[PDB]
Amino acid sequence: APSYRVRRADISGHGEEAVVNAANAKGTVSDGVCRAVAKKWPSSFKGAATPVGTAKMIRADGMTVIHAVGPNFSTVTEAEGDRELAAAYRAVASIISTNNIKSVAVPLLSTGTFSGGKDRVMQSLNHLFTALDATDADVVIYCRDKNWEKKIQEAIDRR
Ligand SMILES: Nc1ncnc2c1ncn2[C@@H]1O[C@H](COP(=O)(O)OP(=O)(O)OC[C@@H](O)[C@@H](O)[C@@H](O)CO)[C@@H](O)[C@H]1O
């Protein structure tokens, strides 16, 4: 069974075997988790473009980077975005299990740039749990907000 922890830290400083980038479909560097991943593992972005609701893995810069593209909730209906967000996390879980990845640092997809201005911490976290429950990986969830950290810890504890 997987284990879940939360850290309030820059995800570029993670101590796991792999890191999930909250990516865009075009594989461009812009504000958010992506900028931190690009600074620490710059060559991880080569050929990283992948459609919304999918993930694409690369080994670069001594790191396994998994580019996962959550939906932009400004560009889909709520129900369409919920389906696509579930799909992005399942694509992450499939890459973790098929590549024997033992531990992974994960940000909450679609909770920042792609949130459509809504609080989606619980929506994103519930899809993260449902998908990564299919793996045996140690999962470390990364956030920057003290209230998010507590919410996430509370949700981990309830389990
Ligand atoms: N360094 C950091 N360490 C830990 N947590 C971090 C972080 N930088 C941002 N976060 C948080 O990670 C979540 C995803 O944000 P993001 O805004 O990065 O994630 P999405 O909402 O999925 O949007 C993706 C787009 O930003 C896309 O264009 C990419 O270029 C960018 O990622 C948000 O809750 C952010 O507050």
Numbering used by the authors: 1 to 159
Study text:
Diffraction data were recorded to 1.85 and 1.6 Å, respectively. In the complex structure at resolution of 1.85 Å the distal ribose is present in a single conformation, whereas the best way to account for difference electron density in the 1.6 Å data set was to model the distal ADP-ribose in a double open conformation. Both structures were determined by difference Fourier synthesis and the final models present excellent stereochemistry. However, due to the ring opening the 4′′-OH is now free to make hydrogen-bonding interactions with the side-chain of Thr113 and the main-chain of Asp31. Here the linear ribose chain underwent a ~ 100° rotation around the bond connecting carbon atoms 4″-C and 3″-C, and consequently the hydrogen-bonding pattern between ADP-ribose and the GETV macro domain changed drastically.
In this TRC, nsP3 has been for a long time the least understood nsP, but recent studies revealed some of its functions in viral replication. nsP3 is organised into three domains: a macro domain (MD) at the N-terminal, a zinc-binding domain (ZBD) and a C-terminal hypervariable region (HVR). Macro domains can recognize ADP-ribose (ADPr), poly-ADP-ribose (PAR) in their free or protein-bound form, or O-acetyl-ADP-ribose (OAADPr). In order to better understand this mechanism, we initiated a structure-based study of the Getah virus (GETV) macro domain, which shows a peculiar substitution for one of the most conserved residues in the catalytic loop, namely serine replacing a glycine in position 30. We produced the GETV macro domain for crystallographic studies, alone or in complex with ADP-ribose, and documented several conformations adopted by ADP-ribose in the binding site.
